[PDB]
Amino acid sequence: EVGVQKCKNALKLPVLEVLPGGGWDNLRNVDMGRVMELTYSNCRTTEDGQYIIPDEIFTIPQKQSNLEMNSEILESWANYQSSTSYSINTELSLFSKVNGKFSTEFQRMKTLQVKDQAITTRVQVRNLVYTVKINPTLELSSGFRKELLDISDRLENNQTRMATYLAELLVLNYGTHVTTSVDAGAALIQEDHLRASFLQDSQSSRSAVTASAGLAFQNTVNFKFEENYTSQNVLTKSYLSNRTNSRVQSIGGVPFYPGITLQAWQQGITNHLVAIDRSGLPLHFFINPNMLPDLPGPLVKKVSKTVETAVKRYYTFNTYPGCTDLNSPNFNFQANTDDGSCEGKMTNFSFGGVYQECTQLSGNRDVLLCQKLEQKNPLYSPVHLLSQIHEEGYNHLECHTVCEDVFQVAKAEFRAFWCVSGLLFGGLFSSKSINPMTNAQSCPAGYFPLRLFENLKVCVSQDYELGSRFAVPFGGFFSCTVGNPLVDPSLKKCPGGFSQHPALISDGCQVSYCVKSGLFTGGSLPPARLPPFTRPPLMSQAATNTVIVTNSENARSWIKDSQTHQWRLGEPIELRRAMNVIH
Amino acid sequence: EVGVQKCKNALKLPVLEVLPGGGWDNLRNVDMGRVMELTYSNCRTTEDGQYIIPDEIFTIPQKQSNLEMNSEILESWANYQSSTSYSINTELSLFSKVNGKFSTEFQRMKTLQVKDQAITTRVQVRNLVYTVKINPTLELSSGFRKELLDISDRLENNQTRMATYLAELLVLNYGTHVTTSVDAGAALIQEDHLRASFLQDSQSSRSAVTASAGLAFQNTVNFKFEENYTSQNVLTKSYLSNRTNSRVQSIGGVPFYPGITLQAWQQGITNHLVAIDRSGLPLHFFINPNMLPDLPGPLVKKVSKTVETAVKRYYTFNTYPGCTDLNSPNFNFQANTDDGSCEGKMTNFSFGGVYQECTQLSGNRDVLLCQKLEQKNPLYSPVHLLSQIHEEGYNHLECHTVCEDVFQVAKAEFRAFWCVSGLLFGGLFSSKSINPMTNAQSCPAGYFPLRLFENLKVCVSQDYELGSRFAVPFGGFFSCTVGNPLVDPSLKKCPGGFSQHPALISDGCQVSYCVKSGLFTGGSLPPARLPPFTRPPLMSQAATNTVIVTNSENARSWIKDSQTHQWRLGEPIELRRAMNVIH
Amino acid sequence: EVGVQKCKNALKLPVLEVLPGGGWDNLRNVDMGRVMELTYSNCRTTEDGQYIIPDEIFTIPQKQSNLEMNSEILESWANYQSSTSYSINTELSLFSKVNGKFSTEFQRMKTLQVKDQAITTRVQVRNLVYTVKINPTLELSSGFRKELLDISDRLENNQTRMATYLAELLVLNYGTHVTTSVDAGAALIQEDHLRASFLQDSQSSRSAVTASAGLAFQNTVNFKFEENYTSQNVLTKSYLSNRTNSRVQSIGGVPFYPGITLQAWQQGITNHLVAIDRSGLPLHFFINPNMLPDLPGPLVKKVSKTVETAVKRYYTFNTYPGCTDLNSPNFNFQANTDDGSCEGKMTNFSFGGVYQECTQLSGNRDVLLCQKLEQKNPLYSPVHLLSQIHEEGYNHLECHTVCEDVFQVAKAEFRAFWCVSGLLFGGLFSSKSINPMTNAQSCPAGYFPLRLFENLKVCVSQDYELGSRFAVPFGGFFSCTVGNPLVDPSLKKCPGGFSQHPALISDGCQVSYCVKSGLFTGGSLPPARLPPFTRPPLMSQAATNTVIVTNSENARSWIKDSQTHQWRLGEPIELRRAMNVIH
């Protein structure tokens, strides 16, 4: 009787199913959450008189219908068009070469080009109908507003590392962007994968290749699967023979089956409309004093700085520099960002060994952390590489039968070294990784592991006749703070010929290691690594109540009242009586 | 008149049958339980106006329809795609190489590749319709909330080993994950198994193999079973002859039968939608002070640590390291995780014998446990391998005719040894296993059993002329704490050439043994070993009442009131009057 | 107006007929009883809107449809797949090699392979629809709860051997398992039995055998019985000639007749759904203090120990060790469990004779049991083999015409011996068996019987010229406590070349005897031996009232009130006043 169903009973019209305002993940092109609030109170319609739209939504009739007769050749996977999220992946940002490179449509296309030495062609019937946009005066959703107040409460009780944790659960549930405009329509695409040596002789008749690819697309749709085709004349005999893959997907409308008139596909697009393009803005753009009137001024500029840090950390991880030229050697298959590390010679290095010590600062009673946090050399110059503090909580139970239990914490800082007539290297495996020497979390035969950063193992053998089959050279560790001195004989990268691999993200800082195997390189493409990148804190910090919030340079002060009402602006006679009881 | 049927009478629409929030087992890809609460109070619909969804659920219209013309070749079973649970099996975890490897679809595919020396190809018509997700503000179910309070009660009465037992009955009923997003659709798959020598000559024309496999798939669906096929031209005469198996399964929609137009299959997908992909989060992620407001802060961080231990124990068991290379010798068929134990030479070892002693600490009266807990040598250096305490309860009946009965417990610790001109080895069989020398729980002819770990038998014969037909060499015992010293002449694994096998899980610690038979290796694939991995405790621990719960480092205290009301936060004037009567 | 018919009148929908919660026998794959309570109060439906389900039941839509084009060859009957109860027969248990080996489907398949020297192939169309499971919070049925209280009453009046008898009537009525999940669907199977020499030449073209077996299955279903088949080309001329049997069974849906389109079979599966797979848990798992809140704690852990003993006794009986290799001699046809007793030489033994004595302890008046309980030698070293006490009740009638009758009991312990120039052996026959020398309960010509264990006869003749046609050698008696000393010249088994046979189960202990005939071996397969394995007791034990139940180690006590109300927990001021009047 309220909301949609009140409008839907009076009008008896469908609701438009393609709406802006939701969140958007831009590494993996998926949408998530609902940032903006959508209400159906005035019973608005599209001025066709055909759909029902919310109140803060205006549509623009496009009624456009493209129809292409030539496929387009896109040879490299580095410059990637998306066909559904092209306007939002190509924004001007620092990470424009990482957007969309963890999606379903991209990971298939990179696989089919590398494993077959192939080039791809697509041809398309696109058919845009509306453009749906949001008004500039707009209200946040009920569930998204409550999660921004919780980050503000943790920042005003001096609880960092809990506000940082709640900011990374905001990226996980609402993405990195907000879509401000969509495009309702229905596409129909065919992608083929031709052998790359079929293009190189037909450099003059490249226009004859793509003319037959768009010719075969309209035989596939118009003719039923039995061969009544009109394309097999001259070069639709090697086009069929140099191709390595073919698929046809429809995105809106009715489902596609071979042999359906393009007349009949285009008459089922009504009431089956999806978003075939979209654009938007980053997520921290919508955190400003205009959208949040209840909080003070400089407090929402501190929440918006926290969320901006969590989004940029999510792009800093899931970024793999390496070599990208396919015909060159040292080709890294997991790399999504070029480095210039191609055509670079190598030089062998000898590492003496790794060792690890612990400190055991506070928790001397009832918990002994400083036995597994220590690792000594099985057999140069060591480097420190990390200063990491490990905290653990335990439980007493004082009984008196009534009892009580108290929770302490136990700190133990550890230090992990490596030496710059030497131990061999057999790979690494962690609690989120495997060793690709064995395709399993095990060192090979003869090798023995030893812990280095409290979560991963270091496959090492001291021999020179039996473990020489799995021995791969080593290039050096570095971190987010200290680069290795092996490059520039500093910078944070591998030397030439080597490739880096992530290992052991530890509280907003990952360390890396350089190898030269060729076996760590290949395999399947890695998935995206989702936030939170930190385990939850133990609530060890005490809450410090803040009552008055001020800034010095325009003489504005916000006084929180009793009862936790709200933040009102401080009149200059009440803050005069509130600072004496404070100071 | 309430719930679904109120919405279903007014709207007269079906309910969407694919919903998130339930649990998920990730070793065996099955779903179980319902973690989140789903209510039908606002009578929401999908904005098509076609289905009825719960209140805390938002759908995203995809309306996508893939159609592939080439099969994909996946040669090895180590890297396994799932086609229905691919997004959730490929999460970043320590056990990413164990996820999905106890399911129905995997165990068939590993069988058909090993027993036939085969490679598999699949081709597919996929047709995604919606994406159904859960809101971030969400309530736990009624039955799942009550089982989290019961683990908290056992932890606050100092009843460990009962809270551990109730945590493993939570994994059994709710799985290891919670699905947060699903994909409603309907697939249609054909899998074939070709002989592996048919690929190796057609390395150039691998694109001609997969083009005919996708050609035979559309003759099978479009043509009725009588041969009107258009594929038998050149190489659809050995493709039919090198294949070893073939099946066609549909996952949603109407049931498949040979000869049905793809037009007709795609018009029955409405109202028959299932989940063709899903993703989610671990189960202990949803145990935090946000979801459970009634309990104190550090108490739900102790329940969530108990459940995380029970899940990681379930992945530690059901993990079989071994050799994986098929053409190599020493191939272990039960192994699902590689080890590097391939291409390793062997060395014979002589074991003198096993013997076992008991202690009989407490239960000296009315129960004699220290006669069957003892086993002496039928005929080096012994090792201790285990220190295990065995508890049994009995019953007095004091009569006075009125009577009364009291229940005691009887402890008897046992020790089990083995010696590092020697007894022969004939296999083992236990209360959850058989001896594969006989395919039965019996020692072979000439062999006599003797108990070692209070539940299993050790097939042993002292002869050298008659029991030499069933004698297999022996590689050494080890445990979860002590590795054997036979490797690295320590580590917890077999020496080279040998294979390990589980035996006698005893209270969260299993022991293993290394053999070299070739007969223990083969057979059928083992099923998953389900929790609980411990028999229920005897309630021997006394309940210690806790009233006040505090942590030192933010000065927060929770005071339980009378009557077992609830846990309220302690004001600093009541805990002042509650600690004096305590201390 | 209540229950099902209230929901069935309002909704006008059928009820789903495949439900969990019932018991299950796992030797004979049949279901029995109803352990869990199923109520229809909320009028729930399957979210299709198609069936009506109970309240504590959640379904999972699968909508899957397999279709196989190759038969599968399973050569041996030792590893047996069931096609309807495969998930529950393959549980990890001590008796995994006995589950399902007394069913209708197994006993036919073992018969057709031994009597024809055949191998079996099956091909199948499987079509799973739902998965129906039970919630973890669940209530026992009304009739099953009342039979658990009756075992508890007999255990608390010190009436053993009546609580043991009532526990074996619980296995008879409710089976050994409880099904917790089923699978609603409809299969369609063809099994053939080919001659075993037809596989051995087609080792390379084994893939051509199974391709024609799945080809003949789809000619049988699609074509009417007149030969319009498309399979008789090359090797569908000896496949038809090497086969020894063929049947086609359907399990759900409409009944099968030759010539019905697979289109038409798959459209009758709606409203005709049966369980095509199931899984579950043992029966004593569901006897815990959670399910039975009324009884005390350690009392339901004593009922659950009694039921676990009765189930394991039912698997200990119905277990036949013997030789299993078919082409080897000494092949035992009744044996369902291997022994290693194949390829073993024999040695003749001479037994002097059997004799039997009685004691007549108590019933000296009015009943003379010690004349038929005695048997003397008709003509070494004797062994005792058994100490069994025989009790019989009689009736006085004291008259005074008014009268009264009193019932006593008469005990008479007997001892049965056999000697380790000798009596010949002609077989045995009992009150539940026959002599297979005559296929009747009679000794052969010249032989005379003599009683040994108060129920069976021992066919014996002292001659050497006339009873030499039916004389078979003898291998020795043993029991559940004492093995024979003839093996290991101890163990409880036959010597080599001999086979054991059950005789005279007497109060939870059977004795066995070893022969070497070849005529006792063959015949038909024995049926399952159902509980109770003990005749009912004579109520000779006096009832001892228990009022207070306690355990020592957590200081909990349960005080039964007056009137036989119930068992309440004892407050520490009432048990203080209840132990003084007790002690």
Ligand SMILES: *[C@@H]1O[C@H](CO)[C@@H](O[C@@H]2O[C@H](CO)[C@@H](O)[C@H](O)[C@H]2NC(C)=O)[C@H](O)[C@H]1NC(C)=O
């Ligand atoms: C507010 O929080 C910050 C962040 O932890 C505190 O700063 C640290 O406090 C510890 C405790 O003495 C010091 O050892 C560190 O050196 C401090 N670090 C920095 C960068 O200042 C701060 O003390 C807290 N303030 C209050 C009043 O609790």
Ligand SMILES: *[C@@H]1O[C@H](CO)[C@@H](O[C@@H]2O[C@H](CO)[C@@H](O)[C@H](O)[C@H]2NC(C)=O)[C@H](O)[C@H]1NC(C)=O
């Ligand atoms: C892949 O493409 C090449 C063209 O670069 C094909 O090679 C030509 O095939 C035609 C077919 O008759 C010949 O007449 C030409 O002589 C070939 N060479 C050149 C340089 O044009 C090749 O055949 C294609 N692959 C397949 C499998 O057909």
Ligand SMILES: *[C@@H]1O[C@H](CO)[C@@H](O[C@@H]2O[C@H](CO)[C@@H](O)[C@H](O)[C@H]2NC(C)=O)[C@H](O)[C@H]1NC(C)=O
């Ligand atoms: C709380 O439970 C723990 C776990 O059993 C108890 O700790 C053990 O208590 C026994 C009994 O004296 C000792 O023999 C063990 O050495 C203890 N082990 C450890 C690791 O402490 C503890 O005593 C219980 N506390 C109370 C008050 O009952």
Ligand SMILES: *[C@@H]1O[C@H](CO)[C@@H](O[C@@H]2O[C@H](CO)[C@@H](O)[C@H](O)[C@H]2NC(C)=O)[C@H](O)[C@H]1NC(C)=O
């Ligand atoms: C399995 O595949 C092999 C190909 O590796 C087939 O061998 C070829 O069969 C064709 C059939 O006429 C012959 O012309 C070729 O000479 C064979 N050899 C090669 C190297 O191509 C083999 O026939 C297939 N199996 C079956 C049963 O047909």
Ligand SMILES: *[C@@H]1O[C@H](CO)[C@@H](O[C@@H]2O[C@H](CO)[C@@H](O)[C@H](O)[C@H]2NC(C)=O)[C@H](O)[C@H]1NC(C)=O
């Ligand atoms: C409770 O029942 C048990 C089981 O029969 C009784 O134990 C036996 O009692 C007889 C009668 O004197 C003795 O001859 C046996 O030696 C006893 N056996 C055992 C194993 O104890 C017991 O006496 C009964 N108790 C009462 C109070 O009636």
Ligand SMILES: *[C@@H]1O[C@H](CO)[C@@H](O[C@@H]2O[C@H](CO)[C@@H](O)[C@H](O)[C@H]2NC(C)=O)[C@H](O)[C@H]1NC(C)=O
């Ligand atoms: C049972 O199978 C055997 C195959 O092992 C059949 O023997 C062959 O029959 C064909 C029929 O013409 C002959 O051409 C072959 O020479 C036979 N021998 C071999 C070794 O292949 C046998 O005929 C089958 N039984 C029946 C009754 O047909």
